[PDB]
Amino acid sequence: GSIGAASMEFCFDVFKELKVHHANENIFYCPIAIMSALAMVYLGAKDSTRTQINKVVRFDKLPGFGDSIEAQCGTSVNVHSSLRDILNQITKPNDVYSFSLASRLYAEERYPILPEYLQCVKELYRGGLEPINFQTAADQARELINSWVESQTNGIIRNVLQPXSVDSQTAMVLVNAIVFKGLWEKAFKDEDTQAMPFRVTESKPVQMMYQIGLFRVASMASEKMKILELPFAXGTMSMLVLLPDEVSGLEQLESIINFEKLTEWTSSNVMEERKIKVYLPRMKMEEKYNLTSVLMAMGITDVFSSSANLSGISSAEXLKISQAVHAAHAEINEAGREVVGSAEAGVDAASVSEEFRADHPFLFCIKHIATNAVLFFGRCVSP
Ligand SMILES: *[C@@H]1O[C@H](CO)[C@@H](O[C@@H]2O[C@H](CO)[C@@H](O)[C@H](O)[C@H]2NC(C)=O)[C@H](O)[C@H]1NC(C)=O
């Protein structure tokens, strides 16, 4: 009924599926971006193709989604508003963070695109739809696609489509890549970062940032875990770090978490501002997933098969999504707007005893504060 609710439910559904084939590895994706890519496809899907997407991504009760409203694509700044409003806001230039989104549908050129659709994507989406020749120059097409994604992500997301992933039979490809970097409200000082061991299960040294400051923390003895909120500068986004008490307690947490639990654990009465010592590793997160495998296991299957019904995009028989890929990159480091002086810090050094030390596997979420929507979610087992 709200983007906050829908993005979190969708996020945890995706998490449940990635857990299957990604045990003991880092996991990192952008739920909001995946929903936007699927919303774009949803615009031209019909029959069961459309129903499966709506059911799995839950566009159902969302503002801007639904029968009458969507029929107005091309005009009306209301279509898919609940999603577009967040993406439109976070992709704008600003002085505290950078969020680059490269999302696009590449369709074989031989497929005549329905003109009402082009207008549709043209007005609601940037990347949109782009014609291309897979038929006789597949390796050439793959180069074109990967070079667009690379160029659009500051040279960060490279070779998104693997060789042999595209051939003379490819109908349409969905690429959805995102890069995020944000400044903390409260910076960590470079001089305070030290090599510290991270107990992966055994351990390895990692660059561990450190600072003492006032932060919202939730302590849940009942679940043997703590949650720390670190605000990004600007007051529009924050990062939640869910840290189990024991080095090997992640599995339990991952089994119990969902939208309801996350909401309860972070409510204003459970969260409390406390002077605390924070240890957080510098992290360079980057993962890429085959969305076809993920979404199919989640319940979206027709759109990827000859039985797909995208008669809203074209009229040609056989238009289906032949490959769909998601890649997300984000660096977590010291950069911030303000810092405590060496004098106050000195006083805290031996007076503050409470600490939040993320030196073992944890879960983390970057959220949009106003909507409560999930922008990124991940599991960090190796910083
Ligand atoms: C991604 O996962 C899918 C399903 O597990 C793999 O299967 C492909 O499915 C697409 C439909 O979107 C077909 O067009 C391909 O011909 C299928 N390829 C095969 C033989 O598996 C798909 O291969 C995976 N993508 C890659 C290259 O990793």
UniProtKB/Swiss-Prot annotation:
Protein function: Non-inhibitory serpin. Storage protein of egg white.
Phenotype when changing N309D: In a minor component
Residues bearing the modification Phosphoserine: S68, S342
Gene: SERPINB14
Annotated transmembrane regions: none
This protein's domain notes: The uncleaved signal peptide becomes available for membrane translocation of ovalbumin when the nascent chain is 50 to 60 residues long. The hydrophobic sequence, which lies between residues 27 and 43, folds back on the preceding residues to form an amphipathic hairpin structure which is the signal element recognized by the membrane.
Keyword Signal in record: yes
Post-translational modification: Undergoes proteolytic cleavage first at the canonical P1-P1' site, and then at the P8-P7 site by subtilisin.
Keywords: Acetylation, Allergen, Calcium, Disulfide bond, Glycoprotein, Metal-binding, Phosphoprotein, Secreted, Signal
Residues listed as glycosylation sites in the UniProt record: N290
Similarity section: Belongs to the serpin family. Ov-serpin subfamily.
GO terms for MF: calcium ion binding; protease binding
Taxonomic lineage: Eukaryota, Metazoa, Chordata, Craniata, Vertebrata
Disulfide bonds listed in the record: C73-C120
Residues spanning the signal sequence: 21-47
Entry's localization field: Secreted
Stated consequence of mutating R337T: Significantly more thermostabilized following cleavage at P-P' site. Inserts reactive loop at very slow rate. No inhibitory action against serine proteinases
The protein, known as: Ovalbumin
Consequence recorded when altering C73A: Lower thermal denaturation temperature, more susceptible to elastase or subtilisin cleavage and assumes a native-like conformation on alkaline treatment
SMART domains hit by this protein: SERPIN
Coarse class of the protein's main subcellular location: secreted
Induction: Down-regulated by dietary stress. Decreased expression at day 14 in the magnum of the oviduct in the corticosterone-fed laying hens.
Residues of the site described as Cleavage: A350, S351, F356, R357
